[PDB]
Symmetry: C3
Subunit: 417 residues, 3 copies
């Protein structure tokens, strides 16, 4: 019955447990460094992250065309001047760049971007991965692997495997969302899908999935979906999910990850910075969970206004695992409210965060900023049960922290450690 005797010691012990727990980051856009140039890293890549492109375009008089015509260094220079020098870098994405520099032993105080660049010029990808995963305390990274991308598909077809720290996830947007165009690529690749949606088309699409499952050994198959997402639906998407994806997933015991609420290309000229958000109906997700009890679903949603009801839906269905605070949700005010709602209604039965890192060094700030918030939530929740006379031990806190940052994910996808 030795246990934690005060809130101040609780806070110390929780913060230490959270900081020390190696993270599984279950959705990123990073790649094993052996995949080469598609692994993005360094300060110029940090600064030209699309979140920062959106932000600089609210201030700068430089036209979008002129921006895209600049070199990466020039874009980074402009972003630095407009968002850090001419106004204080108070936004979450700008703060994050500074957290990264500090983590790396660079000094934000000098504002010396040329000195920062020198740091990265002297390293290999493999070295930077080692440094960054250590600093961010991340043991495992789940990638986003898109067989429709020519520059990724090559490494796979060349027999490359990621190192043991990097795990595959099969990204299926082009197949589910753009089948009218994508069906022709499948044909080019020997999958004899017909004009008509018949048994032959069903079989060849299942074979496409099975071949990539065999190749990648993905931990889940994923898709991003619009605010209008509905299921069942008479559409290529509704048919592919019903006839191909769900049966394959069940057979292979692979979860289906759905990232719902992104409205694509509302400002096309902005590229990756041009996507918007909408509230979705919960009906399709509800139907999927109820009607496919032998399938597992990972869900994150983009609208603030979906988050509470998504937690309630998790209370209804054990084949739903909700994860992370995605994109426009990934800001302190929202991370805090979401994490509290989730813990109040689900206890520790969810995955509080993922980084969605596109640039390697972002693991540093995405985990630092989120861990501090998650630690605050845990401190309050433990203190409340301490107040109720419960005895919490440091071993129990370590166990719960491991569940939230790692074990709940592996347990749900039916694998590792």
């Amino acid at each position: 019955s030795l246990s934690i005797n005060s809130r101040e010691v609780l806070a110390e012990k929780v913060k230490n447990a959270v900081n020390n727990q190696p993270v599984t980051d279950m959705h990123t856009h990073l790649f094993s460094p052996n995949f080469g140039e598609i692994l993005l890293w360094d300060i110029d890549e940090l600064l030209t992250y699309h979140y920062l492109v959106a932000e600089v375009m609210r201030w700068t008089d430089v036209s979008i065309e002129a921006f895209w015509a600049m070199s990466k260094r020039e874009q980074a220079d402009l972003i630095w001047e407009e968002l850090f020098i001419k106004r204080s870098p108070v936004s979450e994405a700008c703060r994050g760049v500074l957290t990264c520099l500090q983590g790396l032993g660079l000094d934000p105080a000098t504002r010396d971007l040329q000195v920062y660049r020198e740091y990265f010029a002297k390293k290999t990808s493999e070295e930077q991965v080692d440094t960054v995963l250590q600093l961010a305390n991340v043991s495992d990274v789940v990638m986003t692997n898109d067989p429709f991308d020519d520059n990724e598909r090559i490494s796979w077809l060349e027999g490359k495997q990621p190192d043991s720290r990097f795990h595959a996830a099969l990204r299926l947007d082009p197949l589910l969302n753009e089948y009218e165009q994508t069906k022709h690529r499948l044909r080019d690749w020997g999958y004899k899908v017909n004009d008509e949606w018949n048994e032959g088309s069903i079989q060849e699409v299942k074979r496409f999935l099975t071949d990539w499952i065999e190749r990648m050994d993905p931990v889940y198959m994923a898709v991003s979906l619009p605010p209008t997402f509905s299921f069942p639906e008479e559409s290529n998407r509704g048919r592919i999910i019903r006839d191909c994806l769900l049966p394959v997933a069940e057979k292979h015991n692979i979860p289906f990850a759905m990232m719902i609420g992104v409205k694509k290309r509302v400002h096309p000229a902005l590229g990756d910075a041009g996507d918007f958000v909408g509230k979705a109906s919960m009906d399709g997700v509800e139907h999927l969970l109820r009607e496919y009890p032998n399938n597992k679903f990972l869900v994150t949603m983009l609208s603030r206004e979906n988050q509470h009801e998504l937690v309630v839906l998790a209370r209804k269905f054990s084949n739903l695992m909700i994860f992370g605070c995605w994109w426009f949700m990934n800001n302190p005010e929202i991370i805090n409210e979401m994490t509290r709602m989730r813990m109040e209604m689900l206890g520790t039965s969810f995955i509080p965060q993922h980084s969605d890192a596109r640039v390697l060094e972002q693991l540093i700030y995405k985990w630092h900023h989120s861990k501090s918030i998650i630690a605050e939530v845990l401190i309050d929740k433990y203190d409340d049960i301490l107040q109720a006379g419960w005895e919490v031990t440091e071993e129990e806190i370590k166990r719960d922290v491991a569940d939230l940052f790692s074990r709940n994910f592996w347990r749900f996808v039916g694998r590792n450690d």
Copy 2:
């Protein structure tokens, strides 16, 4: 003797809040003379449907296997899965520990066998006395359903509740399931016709008036789906327009509408199977505007309805909003709702009800809510103190009494 600093204010407000007897204006408890339908004890607390939903997120035991377990075994499984194997940090898990502690039991031991021994030595009457004392609740409003055969008999035998328990007439089967319920009405001698004519109208009114007579309810209540609309040419829309509203106005009894529940999305979970959806405000707005002589108590289930519900209260004095219902009854939501409510309505609302299904829940439902409501009050008083206003301890006691008891009785026009 003036209140001169936040620190002094905080102690005065917490004392006033703690000391104020509560009227709990919507519960699923029953006067103890109604028998076994009053649920109580640690096995009942642990097998509350909120905890059933939570344990099914973790356990390998199937739902079928779970329902086949005895109550004690279900309670044991829930204890192991939600308190021993993971820390009991959820609001519903924390609530069980609050009740245990309140009763003088020691959660440090985690000894469910010992806790059970406490309950085995007591009668229902003794436990009600204990619980209402510890929760500082003076008055409990029940949910009395004349369509439940069990509950019906008791009222038909002329059994009256204890004076601490007040009736409220539950109408879901009548309003939401008329096709099916009209056959029972006619078994009971209410000659409702196949068509909605004057005959039907008068006999439904007679059913309402008969039950008002028997129950002396403080309000009539219904829970409603996110799709709720009014006017509507449906059985619900016709009964409300033609029968419920006129009867309610004549007897000056409010109509309680609990809006936002989507029933049985996961049928096998039973009570743990219901979901939530955002509702349109249009139907509520229409009722308030078009029936100014009727009074309406509303609580809604969707987070995304709460702010606009507060605005609608600003518009209509015949609306009384109440409580943080079910999926809203979690600290992060209780806090945001109570602040939005106080900022736009001052003290003209009812901040909380327990919806207790198990007697001992009054202990944590009230404990956990009072701490949050006290903190909101402290901030709001502090803000007017900083503006130069002098608040007296007697004024705090008054406002606290309005929130926890008097606003309800004023609105219903009673006690």
Copy 3:
């Protein structure tokens, strides 16, 4: 010295925020040379429509009897019902107290007759000087409606506002009520046709151009319902498309859209009878994308629009979002909005406007909002300070000037 802890940052930020002169970019105040339409004094504070809604939730006085009372009588009733019989803890009630205190009056006495004496002794001009000084407001943007006969007079008599007050051309009757308004245009010599054709288009453009010439407005404004959509084959859709946007582009004048107000759900309440609804973002999205040479100022009334409004501002630099309008202008909501906005937009937004209808409200609207905005800034500067950034006091002063004044003038392309 120089800033190396949260404690020091808090001192510097609070000083910067308190000292920064405010441009209040949307109010319902008027240059004092406009005469009686400039509302001021304690009785006007107390009878603000926010307080009429609140008193009606408590008083037994009927709405008809209320409107039959004199202003002083109305103000007496509201004081008794909202300040004396219950603690004045609501945001709007707290605001009255902050004004009294700011003017050097003592709320501790509750001496309404003494408070009244204060104002009886001053001219409009003196009180404008006092209030703008106390509130640290350098510039006030008015709402000027050429459809209002009284207002139209000062403009037609060539009266110009005092250099501290700026015009904004309010267009609601034209855009929202064209069928009724076309007759008045015709009367004024704007000879619109029955059919929406080139004839009608040119006469509506001429109306706008004439009023732009007369008023020199900083923006043209309209308030819109939750059902607002664009493009739309309606008089509103057509006037915006064919007249308003091209005229705005030619004069480089922004269009301010205040979206989400549902008018007169409770008619008898007058100004206090308006409600809220969530709107589609589709119309605003279309307008921003398809009219890149037009500038748009937007504020929305529903809590549930705020986050997605901030995301839309990330997408479009021709969108400036502003303020926490009306039902949003409460501490709980101001805080969450200001945080969401800063997290996603840095300093590239206008955190607040007063919408003051009564002169003295500038005091509380800015005092209450500045304290919240300062705390949000302290958190955000601290986060980058802890991350190793050197924040200077001059940078703080710059950022604060952008939020409270410069961002507005930069966007509108003026002062």
